[PDB]
Design a protein around this ligand. Structure first.
Ligand code: AM4
Ligand code: CA
Length: 223
């Protein structure tokens, strides 16, 4: 997260870190046994880490649970990043509390102008590299589809939306991938892609979760 602020320990209870010997992507807990992330974050041997703040220091509120199965969206396209979403089932149910909680799925899509909360342990610089150890937060509005399409000609599908600032300076970044975009207490997006980070006229592009509620629900009900 570039241009954000320190969230505060466990203030984003649904945020999870995907670990494969090191943090490589974020994710969101949607129930005691399932996590939603980005399809481009796929890999084998994933351990889900919940209740984390400083990913390099065990503070006492963490829960480390291995993944039992990963399900990438059937129509995921790695070249265009269309349908960049995947589900991860935990080997065992997480213990839910005030510091580890699930985030509700949306019943309707969020409209442009709505303010959302984006979070992650990704790079904090637009130029250079600096990874924080604690969770960073960023409040950003959803942009109109017209401004999004104008920023990325011929690259935005109906399953994507832009959020951020056209002026640049504030945006999600490498390492925040798979992370949540929460608006009005509902999960509306997944950190997916963008050109660089916090660049002028290049806002972040996010997976539009509201288009996948049916797939998510039916998949969880049969696996
Ligand atoms: C490295 S990545 O493709 O995951 C990526 C993730 C986020 C952004 C940001 N501009 N919103 C840019 C790139
Ligand atoms: Ca920790």
């Amino acid at each position: 997260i570039v241009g954000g602020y320190t969230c505060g320990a466990n203030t984003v209870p649904y945020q999870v870190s995907l670990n494969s010997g090191y943090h490589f992507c974020g994710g969101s807990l949607i129930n005691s046994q399932w996590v939603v992330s980005a399809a481009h974050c796929y890999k084998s041997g994933i351990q889900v880490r919940l209740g984390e703040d400083n990913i390099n220091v065990v503070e006492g509120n963490e829960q480390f649970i291995s993944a039992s199965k990963s399900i990438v969206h059937p129509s995921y396209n790695s070249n265009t990043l269309n349908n960049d979403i995947m589900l991860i089932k935990l080997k065992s149910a997480a213990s839910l509390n005030s510091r580890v909680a699930s985030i509700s799925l949306p019943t309707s899509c969020a409209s442009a102008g709505t303010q959302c909360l984006i979070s992650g342990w990704g790079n904090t610089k637009s130029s250079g590299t600096s990874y924080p150890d604690v969770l960073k937060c960023l409040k950003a509005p959803i942009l109109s589809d017209s401004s999004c399409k104008s920023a990325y000609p011929g690259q935005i599908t109906s399953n994507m939306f832009c959020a951020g600032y056209l002026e640049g300076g504030k945006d999600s970044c490498q390492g925040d991938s798979g992370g949540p975009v929460v608006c009005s207490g509902k999960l509306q997006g997944i950190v997916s892609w963008g050109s660089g980070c916090a660049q002028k006229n290049k806002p972040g592009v996010y997976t539009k979760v509201c288009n996948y509620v049916s797939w998510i629900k039916q998949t969880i009900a049969s696996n």
